[PDB]
Amino acid sequence: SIELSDAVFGIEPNNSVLFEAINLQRASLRQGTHAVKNRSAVSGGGRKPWKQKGTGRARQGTIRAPQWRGGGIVFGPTPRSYAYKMPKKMRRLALRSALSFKVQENGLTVVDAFNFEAPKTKEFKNVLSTLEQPKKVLVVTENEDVNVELSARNIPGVQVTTAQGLNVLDITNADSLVITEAAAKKVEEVLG
Amino acid sequence: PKMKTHRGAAKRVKRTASGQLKRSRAFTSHLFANKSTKQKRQLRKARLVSKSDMKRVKQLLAYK
Amino acid sequence: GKQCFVTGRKASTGNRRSHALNSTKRRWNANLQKVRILVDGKPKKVWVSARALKSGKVT
Amino acid sequence: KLHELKPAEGSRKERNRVGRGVATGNGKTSGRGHKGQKARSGGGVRPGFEGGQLPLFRRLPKRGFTNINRKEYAIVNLDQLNKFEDGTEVTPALLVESGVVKNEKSGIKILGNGSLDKKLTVKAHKFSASAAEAIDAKGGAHEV
RNA sequence: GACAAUGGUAGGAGAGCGUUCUAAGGGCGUUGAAGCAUGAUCGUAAGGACAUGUGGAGCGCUUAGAAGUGAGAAUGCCGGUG
RNA sequence: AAGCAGUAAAUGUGGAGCCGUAGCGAAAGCGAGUCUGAAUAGGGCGUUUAGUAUUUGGUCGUAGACCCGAAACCAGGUGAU
RNA sequence: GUAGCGGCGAGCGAAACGGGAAGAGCCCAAACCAACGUUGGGGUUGUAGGACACUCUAGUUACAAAGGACGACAUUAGACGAAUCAUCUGGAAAGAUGAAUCAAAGAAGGUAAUAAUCCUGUAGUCGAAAAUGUUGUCUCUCUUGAGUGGAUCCUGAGUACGACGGAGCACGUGAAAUUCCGUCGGAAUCUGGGAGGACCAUCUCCUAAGGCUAAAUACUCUCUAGUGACCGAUAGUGAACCAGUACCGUGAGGGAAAGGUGAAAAGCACCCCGGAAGGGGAGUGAAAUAGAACCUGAAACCGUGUGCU
Questions:
Q1: How far apart are CA D136 and CA D142, in angstroms?
Q2: Does the distance separating the beta carbons of D2 and A19 come in below 8 Å?
Q3: Long-range contacts of the stretch A82-89 (C-beta < 8 A, 24+)
Q4: What one-character-per-residue DSSP string does A86-105 give?
Q5: Domain D74-142: which topology?
């Protein structure tokens, strides 16, 4: 079957918006979790090592100065978040470009509803090969699929998601997209 | 933290439509016998902050 | 220290300000007097403030 | 394709780093000049007063006061009302939902900058002298 | 292809090389990776390969991303050696 | 925007709020014009009125703020072998 | 970063409204009634409540008064758990080349080299004598609800408040309201009393001077299970190491340096020089210039030969 909306699948992709939407998602799961110590945090070094004058040595205040071995970092890492936000009218514009690009490259397959009621990985591998699908595929359905998401999750390169959980990065990564009839109708109304 | 505005400067100027500042006149406190009639009459008319002084205090009134 | 027996009168702390508004710490003691009052046992001399002495009190 | 990405031409640049070699032009002095107060670590003088000669906003006097009971109303010119159709009851409750007034501070005031060209009845808190004659000339009424 | 321009400190502006890590893609290696050593090699520069010895298990390349990203000197600090 | 929903997930929900569409005056106030003035008589500022949200780079402000270094001050303690 | 405060300098800096998380409110004094200043009943407020008068009708043991036998999960040991063989190079296969097989299991680590199918495991099911938790259904202990009623009573006293000297509210004594402390004066009793930024009048809202109260909030010496465009031995905690230890001070106190043989000790039997140490062979191993001062082994620097000078 061929069931398209002809509105959110036919627009031209916006490369400038599609690039800023991928950088936003990748930078949003970078938990910084990284910190070093400075002069105040290093243990010890509270007295002056030697008098300012009377010796042929340089003047030094603490054994934890940034030049001394074993203490003091000047400008190192610090715990911070990397996530930022973009307007709402640019989020939907980036999703339609990731969905229309697949259609332009001839990589969208509209399949009827699945009838998988028991988890079986060997059974799900057949329909992927029967439908002439590439190595990495994405599966989108209407709602949560028990006994379906349990399968196709041990196959290297197969990802199953929902209709409300589509991502700019999860879509651009797959070679082809496999969507059901009920799902393609749900995606056509949430977008555009 | 947020930037703090110059409270003393906010009591002496006001912003206009183009973006310039309206200022009062000095020498208007006392000693009016030492000045002439033409001098005191032309000191009631307000002026604007000059182009030079604007470059120094442009960020003291960011919220004004 | 010295504290009132009937109520909780005690000293406090403030500032001693001159004409130039110069700050210096100081104390404000209570008017504690030594009187002998009736007790369920033997009458005892205890520190009592002059505010509690007024309005009538046994001595 | 995540293996072929290109940003928009002219939107990205590389930051500047001072004190890294001499060929960059920002080497030893690092863009500060020679010795002075503006060359040490910790900035320089404050643009507010900077010491020295009497500052600017200390040589001019203060002026005026601030009213606490000050009232301010929104303004709807005439060229904004002509989007409605003839025979409509314009109401401060409708002007908000219509999308021409985002916030009513203490009421709506109808100014007369433009031309109405339409037949309406306008309700508002206050009116203007030239905005009350254009509503009634071509027909219509205004009610407070 | 014609004409003109190209000495430079403080300073302004533009274009590039290299180091570490992440993502996607695609490759190399016990028939010997990284590193270390030598050579008469290739680019306008920062720099890039190849062969031959030593080594005994990891590492490039392309496009983007993020920086504890470049050392000759501070009576600089620690180690080794005159 | 907090918040709720969701892998610490990048994502729908949430219009309290913020800027702009109109200025002028110390203010009452008036309004494409408003103040000064007995009087647009003249003059000052407006009739530019396409902005707004996120982000790369330059710079500024508050935080030690490009790095190293005093002679000093205060607070609580240790010492008459 | 608005109102406002401020040698109106530097600087300090709100609240209400609105949008959300969470959300039960109740006990004492007194008038009064039987008893001996005392026990119990009674009784708790502003759209004014109670005492008094007339007929009459759900335990919230986290506040609200507080003791006990009372079933399901959960914590503290664990048990099962699918699927590969062959041939080359090598000391050694997990690699390469061939055919195959599992998957609700392609997290991860080990194993003579790089393993979904070799070993511990993983997904998913099951399991508690005994102790401790979290949560219930009954039991046990408490326990009559509301209208009408001011002729007469009760509703917190050296208190409220004022002057004087200070402090605290964003607010520096200023026109300083609203809250506290020391000293001394010192009220009124529902026709009452307080507040609405000096103060008075009217008009609105609320009842001080007794006492309890769970949730949304802040933090981590710890326990358990996990993550990183975090470090990789001058780094990361001072400390990967038998470290607050050598060591240094009368003392309080101050404080380092030091990881790596090999897959496996299989750690060189015996012979030769030597008093020993250390070497030369022979052996072990894939490799001994991998021999415990043991992976790789840079520069400074110290040497032994030689081609030109």
A1: 8
A2: no
A3: A82/A27, A82/A28, A82/A30, A82/A32, A83/A24, A83/A27, A83/A28, A84/A24, A84/A27, A85/A24, A86/A20, A86/A21, A86/A24
A4: --HHHHHHHHHHHHHHHHHT
A5: Ribosomal Protein L15; Chain: K; domain 2 (3.100.10)
Nearest to A172 among D2, D7, D11 (CB): D2
Q: Among A168, A164, A119, A158, which Cα is nearest to A138's?
A: A158
In order of A91, A108, A111, A135, the CA distances from A177 in angstroms are 20, 5, 10, 11
**What single-letter amino acid sits at B52?**
S
Q: B9 CA, F58 C1': separation in Å?
A: 28
- The Cα A152–Cα A50 span in angstroms is 70
Please answer whether residues D73 and D38 qualify as being in contact, where contact means their C-beta atoms are separated by less than 8 angstroms. Answer: no
**Which residues in chain D have their CB less than 8 angstroms from residue B26's CB?**
59-61
The Cα–Cα gap between C1 and D144 comes to 75
Query: Which residue is associated with the tokens 């183009």?
Result: B18
Tell which strand E nucleotides have any atom below 7 Å from a protein Cβ. 10-16, 23-25, 62-70, 74-78
> How far is Cα A19 from Cα D115, in angstroms, rounded to an integer?
47
Inter-residue long-range contacts of D36-40, CB under 8 Å, 24+ positions, other chains counted: none
> Helices in chain C by DSSP H: which ranges?
50-53
Q: How far apart are CA D131 and CA D134, in angstroms?
A: 6
Q: What technique was this entry resolved by?
A: cryo-EM
* Resolution of this deposited model, Å: 3.1
Rounded distance between C-alpha atoms, residue C29 and residue C9, angstroms? 9
Closest by Cα among A97, C59, C28, C20 to C6:
C59
| Nearest-by-Cβ selection for D48 from B12, B29, B60 | B60
